[PDB]
Amino acid sequence: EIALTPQPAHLTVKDGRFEFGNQLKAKVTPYQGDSIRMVFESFKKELQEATGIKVSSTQKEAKARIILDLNPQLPAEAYKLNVSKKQVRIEASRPAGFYYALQTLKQLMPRNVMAGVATSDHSQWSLPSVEIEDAPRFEWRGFMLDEGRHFFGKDEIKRVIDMMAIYKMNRFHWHLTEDQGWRIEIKKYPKLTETGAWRNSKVLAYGDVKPDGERYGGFYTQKDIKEIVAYAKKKFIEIIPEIDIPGHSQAAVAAYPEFLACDPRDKHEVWLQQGISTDVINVANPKAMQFAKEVIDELTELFPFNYIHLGGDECPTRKWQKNDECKKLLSEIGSSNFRDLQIYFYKQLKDYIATKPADQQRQLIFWNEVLHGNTSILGNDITIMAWIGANAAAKQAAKQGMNTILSPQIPYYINRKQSKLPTEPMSQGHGTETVEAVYNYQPLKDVDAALQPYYKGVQANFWTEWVTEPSVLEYLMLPRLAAVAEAGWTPQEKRNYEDFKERIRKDAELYDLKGWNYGKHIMK
Template identity: 40%
Template sequence: MTGCSSAPTVVADYEVVPAPLQITTAQQSPFVLKSGAVIGYPAGNAKMQKNAEFLAAFLKDQTGMVLKTAEGEGDITLQLGMQDENPEAYQLKVNSDGIVISAPSEAGVFYGIQTLRKSVSAAPDSQVEFPAVEIVDKPRFGYRGMMLDVGRHFFSMDELKTYIDMLALHNINRFHWHLSEDQGWRIEIKKYPKLTEIGSQRKETVIGRNSGKYDGKPYGGFYTQEQAKEIVQYAADRYITVIPEIDLPGHMQAALAAYPELGCTGGPYEVWTQWGVSDNVLCAGNDQTIQFIKDVLAEIIQIFPSEYIHVGGDECPKVKWETCPKCQARIKALGLKSDKQHTKEERLQSYVIHEAEEFLNANGRQMIGWDETLEGGLAPNATVMSWRGEGGGIEAAKQKHDVVMTPNTYLYFDYYQTKDVDGEPLAIGGYLPMERVYSYEPMPQSLTPEEQKYIIGVQANLWTEYIPDFKQVQYMVLPRMAALCESQWCAPEKKNYDEFLKRIIPLVNIYKQKGWNYATHIFDVMLELKPNTEKGTLDAVARTIDNAPIHYTLDGSEPGASSQLYNGVVQIDKPCILRTVAVRPEGNSRMTTDTIFFSKSSMKPITMLQPINKQYEFTGATVLVDGMTGNHNYKTGRWIAFYKNDMEAVIDLKEPTEISSLVLHTCVEKGDWVFDARAIKVFVSDDNKTFKEVASETYPAMKETDPNKIYTHELKFTPVKARYVKVFAQPEHSIPSWHGGKGNPGFLFVDELILN
């Protein structure tokens, strides 16, 4: 039976996420798909039958159309036989007779199906007109991953399956499942039943960011081996490989609570109730420890057929090993020595990782670990996940090891997605808006073409300390996952952020139709505030993803449809509170709010005499004269950093101007090696050549008890007329001995140089 032709017709749009490699439109009649049409697949191929059933289900969800599946050819035909060395490639051809998706493998057909379903977006109770086209597409990287941490917070089987569905929609083919933590052990190990009996339950959970207050509620959960196998199968049906992670030898306090004899002190231990990294780690000098690791991995490889097994290897404090007689005896027996590169304890960690790797290799598996596995010398066949920036990945590729790029500065989805964090659920910190995720180019230019071959993939991570439920998981990863998948799938020349913003709207319609809780920041006003040093104004340039009208106010009142309409650059020349909103029929976007003040240095030309730290350069020196201050998050672009050199800036006031004070703020986050200034000086000049010092202050080294906050430094001096003002600030050149980074330089973050 064909569907009633009175159903409205929607036209498919092949500009989807991720962008296909080649789209060639054909000068032919389109194909109209109606209810009752048949999806054909090769006889006797169970995977292709499943693919056909997936496509029918996707289209029914999105359009209400009921399609049949049958062996042989159909109105939509799924087939193998395309010639391409990339098994995940596909070709999608549409003409007036129908649609054909062909690929070298069933996985390739599945990605063709994703493109087809996304071209329809979500249009209930309609028939679909598919314009004639030929699409040829294939992924840039073979490893396209997304990680979920279930150690800090636990998620149900149905929630995990939804997460896998989310990955499939974004052409992601690896699900990295982080299963063990200081705060909870989540996978059944039959030889060690107490891992789940004791290790999966914590008595309570800290409130907020290690506030010292606790909620008093027991928390726990784990997956049986049968449940884990069910997840593996559910993922495999969608061409996704599950990579399990058992993090060792650190992040093991939950395991030690169950088996205290595996720790250096013998306990007692309890499953950790706070966040962070516990000093209690597996005792590397204990023979039982190595046996325990091998026994656990033996059961893990029975559950998970993946080539890779992740052994963590990150954030393993060595303090217990330094004083543990067994660990020191093991160091001596192995003849490990400290040198300029590594301490003997780091080399001991390397020994533990090597033991794990040898066991996995002997059982036909490959080890993957975080970039700390480089410390003390990398295990011979290991693959490295580079999370602390890209440095570890670059180093590993130069050593001819495979690398998955997952730098926290671009791909940690537990970071905030907006500068305005007051309206957001609590997150770990950081600032990672969609545009920054999208801007990530995984192939480091510093590698030779030969070395670049070792970069095998890209992954984003979601750590769940501050993510207690699945709605929030979705909010943190959607739609940033869309930006991720273009870095994973698309050829670099296909990437264009403005085009991507247009293509993401139909994808978001699928999120809506699925009832997924996505973040809406991309629908807010995108605002650029640039100092115009010629005119002495702050120029506000605004736009929206869909060209929705923007309304604004400058007096701090709430903007709406009756407020001033934005129709070009707004030049701000006096203090104000700028608020903007995008107005749409379905409701207004969130408001942006920026407080702008003017001092004698605002919007004046500025020159740096010493470099800004590249990682935290943002829009550069003008951040110091743009009339805006930063909040306690130093990654928003309102702060710039200095590292391994002093801050030295010259401001041109354009004419002799009387000044008598400087205010300078610093943002301090000691755990991230971000410290206060040690000295500040102010100099003046008439000719920008000869400078005279007019003020200076020095500050003591920070104590462990000094709070993390924004510090205000005000230097007052006898009024002086000058055209040029030089401001000098000295960072902490050597972090104090009480800190884990002792002896290293600290970062100095400054937001504005305020002269009055």
């Protein structure tokens, strides 16, 4: 019983099986300075850890039990995988394609292989004969984690990356800064972490829930950030940092109130509540602009991927309205609409980025509500993450020639409850965002062919207002993460929730072996 998730574009089962011994020979293309050989070496280590099988090299076709060949006609993440009694044959055009072919290969084996866990007893190992041709539907297949509200740390984020890689996801969006915490070391502004990474409650207060008096927090050093980026790159996951400015910035304001606060004479502390804060950055202060530039500079050094997310939330303008510098700047830009200050701030930063050498330039991503503002000055070389009225907003973005990513609150905010049972952990929602609901979302329903090139893909987002424990994070992430991964990867014509349900059931064993929690509703 073969169970592949995401389901490949094309799968044909054939007669017989390929058997591994304790040792066998592989021939691997030397394409791009042995890059594919490096991918294969990582695979060899994983295989040996789980099965004891050792692979050696050959240059002879006739002696190669496994062969990785270059086929330049295939798309950048595409592959062919042909398993017969005599040979495993893989073709791809790019490293990621070889990597994905090998992920599929592992998935055809017992779940302990994908889990990277050995059996205690002697086992023998084989693959079903198959012909697979596969390629992702979308180039952006993403997961966002909020570590601003609750910090999980390096080991847990490595596990998150591990989960993503199993399901061939390729974009990790790291929501690192918030009203309630700042989680990334910035060398020029050390108080962002010293002040902003710690606060006097673990829980975030809302309604009947009050602050709990626990001194709580944490942050990533730059060394940690580089380590995680490198770890993710080995699994073909690129990382997008999100540093929210000037909204969702209360932690930064608490760190440097003397120039970031609109009201510096007032007390500023890290927020212990859930909600929307009015304590926004004073975008009219020249030192605040210097700060934003210096933060972007440091992000460029740490994150090699070509995008930065700056938020674009419709932050409260109340404090700007009461600030002499902000009132003066608004008058100077010839406006009476304070939202124009936020857009002006972004334009400044976009212009600054454009002054940098090409390799240091980054494209900006914003949440779709930014488009409610007067955004003409930003041009159309921005990317829109569509989360609220997502289908309508994505269409609007595409009509303006902006690339767009679909992350609808309903149903891709997978921190939301996944069941109506009274025993579920506390999180947002009422229990309607079941695995079925997540899977059934159709990203290109009713999207005109002309607009489709702008739709880069899909992303599940995980907000952590309520989620304080890794066990709960995992419980909510899985298995809905796989449903979104399948939406991202599998052609529409091969998608079917009932079929997915049967396949994803096979991964309970994987999750158990890895020690991951998961929702049990569709399992067993």
